[PDB]
mmCIF file of C-alpha atoms and ligand atoms in Angstrom:
data_model
loop_
_atom_site.group_PDB
_atom_site.id
_atom_site.type_symbol
_atom_site.label_atom_id
_atom_site.label_comp_id
_atom_site.label_asym_id
_atom_site.label_seq_id
_atom_site.Cartn_x
_atom_site.Cartn_y
_atom_site.Cartn_z
ATOM 1 C CA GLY D 1 -0.217 -0.325 0.069
ATOM 2 C CA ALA D 2 1.062 3.866 0.864
ATOM 3 C CA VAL D 3 0.181 6.523 2.302
ATOM 4 C CA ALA D 4 -0.563 9.798 0.725
ATOM 5 C CA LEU D 5 -0.854 13.609 1.816
ATOM 6 C CA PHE D 6 -3.984 15.842 0.167
ATOM 7 C CA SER D 7 -3.364 19.326 0.671
ATOM 8 C CA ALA D 8 -6.399 21.256 2.146
ATOM 9 C CA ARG D 9 -7.783 24.069 -1.123
ATOM 10 C CA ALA D 10 -8.437 26.320 1.542
ATOM 11 C CA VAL D 11 -3.926 21.003 6.815
ATOM 12 C CA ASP D 12 -2.867 17.789 5.377
ATOM 13 C CA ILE D 13 -5.078 15.343 4.834
ATOM 14 C CA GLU D 14 -3.527 11.320 4.999
ATOM 15 C CA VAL D 15 -5.136 8.302 3.078
ATOM 16 C CA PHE D 16 -4.323 5.097 2.947
ATOM 17 C CA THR D 17 -4.391 3.575 -0.250
ATOM 18 C CA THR D 18 -4.232 -0.533 -1.766
ATOM 19 C CA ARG D 19 -4.317 1.460 -4.817
ATOM 20 C CA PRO D 20 -2.118 4.564 -5.409
ATOM 21 C CA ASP D 21 -1.918 3.986 -9.874
ATOM 22 C CA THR D 22 -5.227 5.153 -9.033
ATOM 23 C CA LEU D 23 -4.863 8.265 -7.149
ATOM 24 C CA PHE D 24 -5.941 10.458 -11.241
ATOM 25 C CA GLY D 25 -9.331 8.916 -10.907
ATOM 26 C CA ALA D 26 -10.082 9.842 -6.580
ATOM 27 C CA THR D 27 -12.771 12.691 -7.379
ATOM 28 C CA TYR D 28 -13.550 12.455 -3.647
ATOM 29 C CA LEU D 29 -11.978 12.094 0.430
ATOM 30 C CA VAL D 30 -14.161 10.832 3.426
ATOM 31 C CA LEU D 31 -12.938 11.170 6.877
ATOM 32 C CA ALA D 32 -14.347 8.665 9.821
ATOM 33 C CA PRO D 33 -17.057 10.550 11.097
ATOM 34 C CA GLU D 34 -14.996 10.286 14.302
ATOM 35 C CA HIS D 35 -11.996 11.925 12.546
ATOM 36 C CA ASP D 36 -9.831 14.870 14.631
ATOM 37 C CA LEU D 37 -9.272 17.117 11.472
ATOM 38 C CA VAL D 38 -13.689 17.106 10.279
ATOM 39 C CA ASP D 39 -14.506 20.329 13.395
ATOM 40 C CA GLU D 40 -11.017 21.721 11.803
ATOM 41 C CA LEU D 41 -12.301 21.361 7.815
ATOM 42 C CA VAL D 42 -15.901 22.822 8.408
ATOM 43 C CA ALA D 43 -16.676 25.282 6.123
ATOM 44 C CA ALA D 44 -19.191 28.056 7.825
ATOM 45 C CA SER D 45 -21.956 27.587 5.260
ATOM 46 C CA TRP D 46 -22.690 25.700 2.205
ATOM 47 C CA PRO D 47 -21.158 26.540 -1.311
ATOM 48 C CA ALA D 48 -23.984 28.178 -3.325
ATOM 49 C CA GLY D 49 -25.674 25.021 -6.001
ATOM 50 C CA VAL D 50 -24.888 22.268 -3.750
ATOM 51 C CA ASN D 51 -25.903 18.995 -4.455
ATOM 52 C CA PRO D 52 -28.944 19.099 -1.495
ATOM 53 C CA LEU D 53 -28.073 15.328 -1.327
ATOM 54 C CA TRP D 54 -24.689 16.331 0.045
ATOM 55 C CA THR D 55 -26.301 17.965 3.192
ATOM 56 C CA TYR D 56 -28.282 15.779 5.051
ATOM 57 C CA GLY D 57 -30.922 18.537 4.775
ATOM 58 C CA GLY D 58 -28.810 20.620 7.399
ATOM 59 C CA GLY D 59 -28.722 24.629 6.934
ATOM 60 C CA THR D 60 -25.002 25.208 8.039
ATOM 61 C CA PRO D 61 -22.014 22.545 7.303
ATOM 62 C CA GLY D 62 -20.967 22.332 11.147
ATOM 63 C CA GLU D 63 -25.300 21.391 11.838
ATOM 64 C CA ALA D 64 -25.506 18.634 9.078
ATOM 65 C CA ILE D 65 -21.829 17.110 11.328
ATOM 66 C CA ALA D 66 -23.017 17.993 14.239
ATOM 67 C CA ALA D 67 -26.523 16.093 13.051
ATOM 68 C CA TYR D 68 -24.835 12.901 11.364
ATOM 69 C CA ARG D 69 -23.254 11.662 13.868
ATOM 70 C CA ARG D 70 -26.153 11.895 16.310
ATOM 71 C CA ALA D 71 -27.477 9.918 13.618
ATOM 72 C CA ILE D 72 -25.384 7.156 13.108
ATOM 73 C CA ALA D 73 -25.202 6.538 16.988
ATOM 74 C CA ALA D 74 -28.804 5.462 16.768
ATOM 75 C CA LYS D 75 -27.529 2.561 14.099
ATOM 76 C CA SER D 76 -27.369 -0.794 15.992
ATOM 77 C CA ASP D 77 -25.056 -3.574 14.814
ATOM 78 C CA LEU D 78 -27.047 -4.904 12.229
ATOM 79 C CA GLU D 79 -27.221 -1.533 10.596
ATOM 80 C CA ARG D 80 -23.539 -1.430 10.730
ATOM 81 C CA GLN D 81 -22.887 -5.110 9.197
ATOM 82 C CA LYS D 82 -24.156 4.588 2.087
ATOM 83 C CA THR D 83 -24.883 7.902 3.571
ATOM 84 C CA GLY D 84 -22.735 10.764 4.592
ATOM 85 C CA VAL D 85 -21.969 14.013 4.507
ATOM 86 C CA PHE D 86 -20.481 16.872 2.104
ATOM 87 C CA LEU D 87 -17.772 19.869 4.773
ATOM 88 C CA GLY D 88 -18.557 22.128 2.762
ATOM 89 C CA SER D 89 -14.880 22.641 1.485
ATOM 90 C CA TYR D 90 -12.674 20.987 -0.976
ATOM 91 C CA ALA D 91 -9.194 18.805 -0.486
ATOM 92 C CA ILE D 92 -6.044 19.028 -3.865
ATOM 93 C CA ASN D 93 -5.720 15.655 -5.780
ATOM 94 C CA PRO D 94 -1.683 15.876 -6.267
ATOM 95 C CA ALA D 95 -1.852 13.649 -9.114
ATOM 96 C CA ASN D 96 -3.873 16.271 -11.305
ATOM 97 C CA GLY D 97 -4.063 19.168 -8.832
ATOM 98 C CA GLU D 98 -8.066 18.923 -9.129
ATOM 99 C CA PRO D 99 -10.393 20.071 -6.332
ATOM 100 C CA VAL D 100 -12.117 17.531 -4.452
ATOM 101 C CA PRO D 101 -15.484 17.465 -1.897
ATOM 102 C CA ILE D 102 -14.308 16.367 1.270
ATOM 103 C CA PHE D 103 -16.651 14.163 3.004
ATOM 104 C CA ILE D 104 -17.292 12.268 6.455
ATOM 105 C CA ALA D 105 -19.104 9.150 5.992
ATOM 106 C CA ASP D 106 -18.949 6.197 7.992
ATOM 107 C CA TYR D 107 -18.725 3.576 6.100
ATOM 108 C CA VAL D 108 -15.017 4.955 6.667
ATOM 109 C CA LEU D 109 -13.755 3.363 10.257
ATOM 110 C CA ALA D 110 -12.085 6.120 12.420
ATOM 111 C CA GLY D 111 -9.386 3.549 13.886
ATOM 112 C CA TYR D 112 -8.276 1.752 10.935
ATOM 113 C CA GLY D 113 -5.576 3.097 8.232
ATOM 114 C CA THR D 114 -5.184 6.901 8.596
ATOM 115 C CA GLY D 115 -9.213 7.032 9.360
ATOM 116 C CA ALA D 116 -9.516 8.642 6.291
ATOM 117 C CA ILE D 117 -9.632 7.023 2.098
ATOM 118 C CA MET D 118 -9.511 8.806 -1.068
ATOM 119 C CA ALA D 119 -12.450 7.670 -2.983
ATOM 120 C CA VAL D 120 -11.924 6.296 -6.443
ATOM 121 C CA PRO D 121 -15.396 5.276 -7.712
ATOM 122 C CA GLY D 122 -13.980 3.824 -10.840
ATOM 123 C CA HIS D 123 -12.004 1.041 -8.727
ATOM 124 C CA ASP D 124 -13.700 0.640 -6.040
ATOM 125 C CA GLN D 125 -17.267 -0.952 -5.788
ATOM 126 C CA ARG D 126 -17.900 0.399 -1.896
ATOM 127 C CA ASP D 127 -17.521 3.829 -3.819
ATOM 128 C CA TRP D 128 -19.389 3.017 -6.590
ATOM 129 C CA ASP D 129 -22.760 2.995 -4.793
ATOM 130 C CA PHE D 130 -22.004 6.580 -2.655
ATOM 131 C CA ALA D 131 -20.563 8.299 -5.611
ATOM 132 C CA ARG D 132 -23.204 6.417 -7.386
ATOM 133 C CA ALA D 133 -26.005 7.733 -4.191
ATOM 134 C CA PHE D 134 -24.348 11.143 -3.987
ATOM 135 C CA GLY D 135 -24.337 12.506 -7.912
ATOM 136 C CA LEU D 136 -19.970 12.256 -7.134
ATOM 137 C CA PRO D 137 -18.108 11.840 -10.337
ATOM 138 C CA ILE D 138 -16.663 9.033 -11.659
ATOM 139 C CA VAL D 139 -13.577 8.592 -13.018
ATOM 140 C CA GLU D 140 -11.798 5.701 -15.108
ATOM 141 C CA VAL D 141 -8.163 5.006 -14.460
ATOM 142 C CA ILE D 142 -7.968 1.488 -15.403
ATOM 143 C CA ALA D 143 -9.324 -0.268 -19.011
ATOM 144 C CA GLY D 144 -10.331 -3.199 -18.723
ATOM 145 C CA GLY D 145 -13.907 -3.130 -17.384
ATOM 146 C CA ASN D 146 -17.068 -1.352 -17.974
ATOM 147 C CA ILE D 147 -17.400 1.268 -15.180
ATOM 148 C CA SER D 148 -20.884 2.380 -16.062
ATOM 149 C CA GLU D 149 -21.675 -1.199 -14.991
ATOM 150 C CA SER D 150 -19.428 -2.212 -11.916
ATOM 151 C CA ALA D 151 -16.310 -0.969 -10.379
ATOM 152 C CA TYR D 152 -13.689 -2.369 -12.093
ATOM 153 C CA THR D 153 -10.904 -3.498 -9.623
ATOM 154 C CA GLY D 154 -8.596 -6.420 -11.509
ATOM 155 C CA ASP D 155 -5.916 -5.617 -13.290
ATOM 156 C CA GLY D 156 -5.506 -3.435 -17.003
ATOM 157 C CA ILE D 157 -3.637 -0.981 -18.373
ATOM 158 C CA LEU D 158 -3.590 3.069 -17.255
ATOM 159 C CA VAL D 159 -5.611 5.314 -19.017
ATOM 160 C CA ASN D 160 -6.703 9.096 -17.608
ATOM 161 C CA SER D 161 -3.315 9.541 -15.861
ATOM 162 C CA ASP D 162 -0.924 11.415 -17.792
ATOM 163 C CA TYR D 163 1.931 9.930 -16.537
ATOM 164 C CA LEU D 164 0.918 6.619 -15.812
ATOM 165 C CA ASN D 165 -0.772 6.639 -19.256
ATOM 166 C CA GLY D 166 -0.178 2.415 -20.724
ATOM 167 C CA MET D 167 1.293 1.185 -17.794
ATOM 168 C CA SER D 168 0.554 -2.377 -16.340
ATOM 169 C CA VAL D 169 -1.344 -1.442 -12.589
ATOM 170 C CA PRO D 170 2.214 -3.235 -10.979
ATOM 171 C CA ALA D 171 4.113 -1.041 -12.797
ATOM 172 C CA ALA D 172 2.252 2.550 -11.994
ATOM 173 C CA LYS D 173 2.158 1.401 -8.575
ATOM 174 C CA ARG D 174 5.639 2.089 -8.413
ATOM 175 C CA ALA D 175 5.708 4.824 -10.900
ATOM 176 C CA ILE D 176 2.787 6.851 -8.732
ATOM 177 C CA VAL D 177 5.127 5.894 -5.254
ATOM 178 C CA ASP D 178 8.163 7.001 -6.735
ATOM 179 C CA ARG D 179 6.136 10.578 -7.912
ATOM 180 C CA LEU D 180 4.950 11.358 -4.327
ATOM 181 C CA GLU D 181 8.326 10.210 -2.731
ATOM 182 C CA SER D 182 10.303 12.835 -4.945
ATOM 183 C CA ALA D 183 7.218 15.715 -3.534
ATOM 184 C CA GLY D 184 8.341 14.567 -0.640
ATOM 185 C CA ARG D 185 3.396 13.699 -0.504
ATOM 186 C CA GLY D 186 4.014 9.735 0.086
ATOM 187 C CA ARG D 187 5.381 6.269 1.477
ATOM 188 C CA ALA D 188 4.978 3.327 0.226
ATOM 189 C CA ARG D 189 3.762 1.459 3.318
ATOM 190 C CA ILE D 190 3.476 -2.700 4.032
HETATM 191 C C1 A52 G 1 -9.749 -3.260 -0.152
HETATM 192 C C2 A52 G 1 -9.177 -2.898 -1.409
HETATM 193 O O1 A52 G 1 -8.882 -1.355 -1.003
HETATM 194 C C3 A52 G 1 -9.168 -0.308 -2.394
HETATM 195 C C4 A52 G 1 -9.602 -0.454 -3.786
HETATM 196 C C5 A52 G 1 -9.751 -0.103 -5.015
HETATM 197 C C6 A52 G 1 -9.141 0.925 -4.570
HETATM 198 C C7 A52 G 1 -8.995 1.798 -3.759
HETATM 199 C C8 A52 G 1 -9.170 1.263 -2.350
HETATM 200 B B1 A52 G 1 -8.667 2.036 -1.208
HETATM 201 O O2 A52 G 1 -9.438 2.044 0.297
HETATM 202 C C9 A52 G 1 -9.204 2.463 1.102
HETATM 203 C C10 A52 G 1 -7.610 1.207 1.001
HETATM 204 O O3 A52 G 1 -7.281 0.801 -0.183
HETATM 205 C C11 A52 G 1 -7.866 -0.050 1.516
HETATM 206 C C12 A52 G 1 -7.076 -0.745 2.209
HETATM 207 O O4 A52 G 1 -7.698 -2.145 3.067
HETATM 208 P P1 A52 G 1 -7.375 -3.385 4.195
HETATM 209 O O5 A52 G 1 -6.315 -3.375 2.451
HETATM 210 O O6 A52 G 1 -6.671 -2.457 4.603
HETATM 211 O O7 A52 G 1 -8.055 -4.445 3.610
HETATM 212 O O8 A52 G 1 -9.628 0.295 1.865
HETATM 213 C C13 A52 G 1 -9.565 1.418 2.231
HETATM 214 N N1 A52 G 1 -9.122 1.706 3.595
HETATM 215 C C14 A52 G 1 -8.425 2.474 4.501
HETATM 216 N N2 A52 G 1 -9.266 3.110 5.285
HETATM 217 C C15 A52 G 1 -10.429 2.131 5.709
HETATM 218 C C16 A52 G 1 -10.894 2.913 6.280
HETATM 219 N N3 A52 G 1 -10.742 3.051 7.679
HETATM 220 N N4 A52 G 1 -11.924 2.698 6.525
HETATM 221 C C17 A52 G 1 -12.386 1.988 5.517
HETATM 222 N N5 A52 G 1 -11.616 1.974 4.421
HETATM 223 C C18 A52 G 1 -10.274 2.124 4.309
HETATM 224 O O9 A52 G 1 -7.783 3.124 -1.847
HETATM 225 C C19 A52 G 1 -8.415 2.885 -3.340
HETATM 226 C C20 A52 G 1 -9.925 4.203 -2.896
HETATM 227 N N6 A52 G 1 -10.740 3.270 -1.908
#
């Protein structure tokens, strides 16, 4: 795997991924609801024209995050075995320099990895399900499947990924970690 940093657009969010090769397909970030950085990253107001599905029916991001934390406490083991809320803020994808929205969602566990993920709906079914429910971008970076039907999780050839294009998944993993290390923004990790 790898750890990588995403800068807040307006603070670094460290993610753990077993698919660093898919970085050019990371279209949003998800933090555990209990993640220490959430309160820091919560915007004062919603952006104009925000998708209502993203707001949990809250008037402000802070109210929505408080309500989400309170609501998920009413879940039992039954429910725990896709919902979430936009923080109103963005991080920068270090591969493409693009802003990506930051969410909390209870599908991300606080005490595992770094407690935060990069979301790649094209290639992780959990992220595909979330993106379909919320109306988030789904981008193909590994050719081999059909992202309109389901996340493609297998080996393939890199597309839409600049200096990774044409590489196999194993080659792209090595190349992107090299790039992250040269930039000081990530590391390979067991
Ligand atoms: C397992 C397939 O993962 C895939 C497959 C395709 C693409 C990806 C990933 B992967 O999601 C992260 C991390 O890598 C992966 C680490 O899981 P393992 O090995 O520790 O069991 O799980 C996800 N993960 C990491 N931390 C957490 C967490 N705290 N809570 C929930 N899921 C997490 O990154 C990309 C975008 N999602």
